[PDB]
Amino acid sequence: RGEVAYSGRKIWPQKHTGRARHGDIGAPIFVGGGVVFGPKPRDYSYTLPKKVRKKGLAMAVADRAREGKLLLVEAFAGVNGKTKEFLAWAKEAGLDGSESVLLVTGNELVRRAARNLPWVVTLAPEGLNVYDIVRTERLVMDLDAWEVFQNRIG
Amino acid sequence: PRAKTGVVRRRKHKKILKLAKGYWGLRSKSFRKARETLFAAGNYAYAHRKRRKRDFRRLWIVRINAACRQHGLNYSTFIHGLKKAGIEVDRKNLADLAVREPQVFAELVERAKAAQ
Amino acid sequence: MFAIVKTGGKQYRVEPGLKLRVEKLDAEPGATVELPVLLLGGEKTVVGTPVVEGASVVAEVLGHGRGKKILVSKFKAKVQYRRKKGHRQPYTELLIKEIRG
Amino acid sequence: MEAKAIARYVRISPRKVRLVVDLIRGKSLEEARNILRYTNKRGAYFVAKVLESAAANAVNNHDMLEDRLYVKAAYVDEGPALKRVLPRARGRADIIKKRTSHITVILGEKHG
Amino acid sequence: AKHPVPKKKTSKARRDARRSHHALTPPTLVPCPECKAMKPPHTVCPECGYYAGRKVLEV
Amino acid sequence: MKTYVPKQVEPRWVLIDAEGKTLGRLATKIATLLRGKHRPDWTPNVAMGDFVVVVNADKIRVTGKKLEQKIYTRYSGYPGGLKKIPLEKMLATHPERVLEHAVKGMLPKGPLGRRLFKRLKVYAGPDHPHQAQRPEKLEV
RNA sequence: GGAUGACCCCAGGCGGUAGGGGAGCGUUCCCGAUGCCGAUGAAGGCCGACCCGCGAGGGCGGCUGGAGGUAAGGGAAGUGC
RNA sequence: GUGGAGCCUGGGAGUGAGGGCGCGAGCGAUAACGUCCGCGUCCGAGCGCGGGAACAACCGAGACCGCCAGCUAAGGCCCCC
RNA sequence: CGUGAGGGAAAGGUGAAAAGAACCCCGGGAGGGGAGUGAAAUAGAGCCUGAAACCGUGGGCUUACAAGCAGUCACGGCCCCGAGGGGUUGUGGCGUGCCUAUUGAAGCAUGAGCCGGCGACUCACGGUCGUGGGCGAGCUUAAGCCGUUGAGGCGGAGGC
């Protein structure tokens, strides 16, 4: 009611008009008045413990490992940037697109080729995060991304 | 995010107005007067289903009383006779018997006069 | 012939062929049950003191149900006290098979 | 078969015109015309107009016979009111409502 | 005086009951013996100008 | 089972001789007959009792000094409009009203109660004009 | 009892203002969702004597409407007159 | 004496205008639907139920829901009833 | 609106496309009835949806000897949909509106004409208990920095 555009004038006298008492028309009891306890710009972030984050990371990968949904690869045969190239590689690797896949690799050309597939989410290893792991039905990592992961939960 | 009233209050008001169909004037047209009328209505129904049990027992007793006095005794002596005879036919069935089966009620009167 | 039976804490005049709702009984639908008799009437008159020793009524339980909902509503003025309860009374439905006098 | 006409937004108060419409409901066309002709009410002019428009619709659009026509239904509904300021004493302003009317006449055929 | 004022809003029932005497009576009309037109009794006929069996005005 | 509700019955006309009987002790019985509470099928929301004819209502009797001291009272609605009439004068002027008043006060208030009062027919003198109804004489 | 909220049986408590505690319903929005329901008809509206729920409510059916809506499970509030 | 008993620690209160009645006193006039304490009680919060013609606190009695079943309480049983 | 400084509104939506209704009919016109357009015209411009108060027309039941916080319990009559139910209400029983404030209100104490929509326990930082987890003689980072472009990591100054 202080931030609203109206004057602070008392709209009519306190007593003897036969109307209810009022002050200015910005009060929240008026149509067009200020709002009581409305939202204000707000920071929702908070510092979750680092050890909780790191342990969550390891558990999320463990969960896929225990399901058999974690697959590591040395190299992406001949995928050089084209989505069709990654699709061929995926088929031979058993990724027929019936399951969503989180693809973690530092190879840019592999990420650019897979990323437009509706069933693939692509990450560089330094961006491995548990929400993205739990989002997807399968985990597919470079041996290089795997070592970055192992360095981070250590 | 904002959560304006929307549909919620209209729907609550229609539930109440629907329960108030048949009420006089604004008691079926105004949400406020209908709600006030229903407050009373619910208490009455509660109080009156308690009361209905007494209303009917009163009717049975009155009919039983007249049936007895056609055979020369009154209700209280009749009931006492039934208690000494060990007869446990309740007042709802006794009043039915007094109307629908006068030969059986005449017998029951016999048992009662004889049980004293 | 008619009989006055007692079930569910209450008394009913029953004749063969009568369908009747009584308080819920623990009896499978389709089964038949025997109701105790307080009085026989019609042809002969038998008076129980209180219940007739030999007599019984055979009834086939047709099924169980829940009665039409009753709104139990409580309100106390000037005290913001309101209560709304929905009540459905269970019942067993009986077909009166015979008066075994 | 029915024939109808509506005069919408007639600048007259519904309560006033209804009194006149009630005069001709259920009448034969000819009997309604005589009544409306000698009804000493402003509303007689407007109802007559709608009555004749319905009759014309019956004969010219809907294959009905003028000599069979009767007022099968008739009703006045209220339109948007024109709100006007009426100045009073001591600086107070009242609001006059110059009400308006939607006049419906429906004619049928009385057989025989 | 001290400005008498309605104590309660009049119900729809009571408003409309007061109006039970408001229905118009239809205009009384007799036939003109000359031109057969319907017209009020005891007036010069407005359709043909006759009254008492003779022509009184131009119509 | 539901409680028996009677279909419309032909009512019973009865004749009572009031001579020598005690005003209020006779009236309680007449009201019982009017309500039909002597009947095994009594129902409180219908007029199903007897029609009661009374003769020799002017010969009704009363104990103590009531002939002089019992005061009937009528209020006209005007200032000073409380009229007091003693039993004596009422018996000398409208004797049938003495019993009529006693019975009316013993009937329920309301529309049915007023209807029941119309089923009571009270006559001074030994005669009544209801021979066509052939009333059954009651000793009460 | 059986082992654990699986359901049953027995017993007992269950008036309530200020007020303490518990369990739920619904509204707006986010994840779920590149999904799913949808012109063979979304949301909203109007009916219902039907079904489920103690209840707040939730279904289902007929009509209207004509393009949106959004599950199990969780998250956040401009959340119920 | 196993009770919505008690004790200990801690979280959240609300209340700090009472009122009638019985008994015991003071004040008052061996006045007040008066006033001020004490013991108890009810209403407050049981303006829910029966009785008392009607009626917070007098008598009866502590309303979880349903029944067209039965026994009682105070109070009643000539008619209203 | 105010002399003036100054105050300060309301008011969005046809349809996919104007195809925005030629022409005829009643009417001075307004308006309407046909024709015609459209998947749809109670989408016809006073235009999406179209609640409620409020006002009509038609129909069912009911009402002029009756005592009323307007209901509720019972029974009966009539009407409707097909051992049942819906509507209505004649009679009988019972029955002191809602909220607020009070020792105490139906109260002749407050507030409310009625309806619809707006309308009041929040947020930041700190604190104190409780609680779900992480780690444990330790626990934890802040500003920043690097990365990301709804990716997280680093950073021990400092705090307990």
Ligand SMILES: NC(=[NH2+])NCCC[C@H](N)C(=O)O
């Ligand atoms: N390699 C990456 N950083 N990929 C991020 C994904 C970016 C974008 N959201 C996409 O789906 O294409």
Ligand SMILES: [Mg+2]
């Ligand atoms: Mg302000």
Ligand SMILES: [Mg+2]
């Ligand atoms: Mg300001």
Ligand SMILES: [Mg+2]
């Ligand atoms: Mg400002």
Ligand SMILES: [Mg+2]
């Ligand atoms: Mg400004």
Ligand SMILES: [Mg+2]
């Ligand atoms: Mg300003």
Ligand SMILES: [Mg+2]
């Ligand atoms: Mg200011």
Ligand SMILES: [Mg+2]
């Ligand atoms: Mg101000």
Ligand SMILES: [Mg+2]
């Ligand atoms: Mg100012």
Ligand SMILES: [Mg+2]
């Ligand atoms: Mg100022």
Ligand SMILES: [Mg+2]
């Ligand atoms: Mg003032």
Ligand SMILES: [Mg+2]
């Ligand atoms: Mg005022």
Ligand SMILES: [Mg+2]
């Ligand atoms: Mg005001």
Ligand SMILES: [Mg+2]
């Ligand atoms: Mg005002």
Ligand SMILES: [Mg+2]
């Ligand atoms: Mg003011």
Ligand SMILES: [Mg+2]
């Ligand atoms: Mg203000």
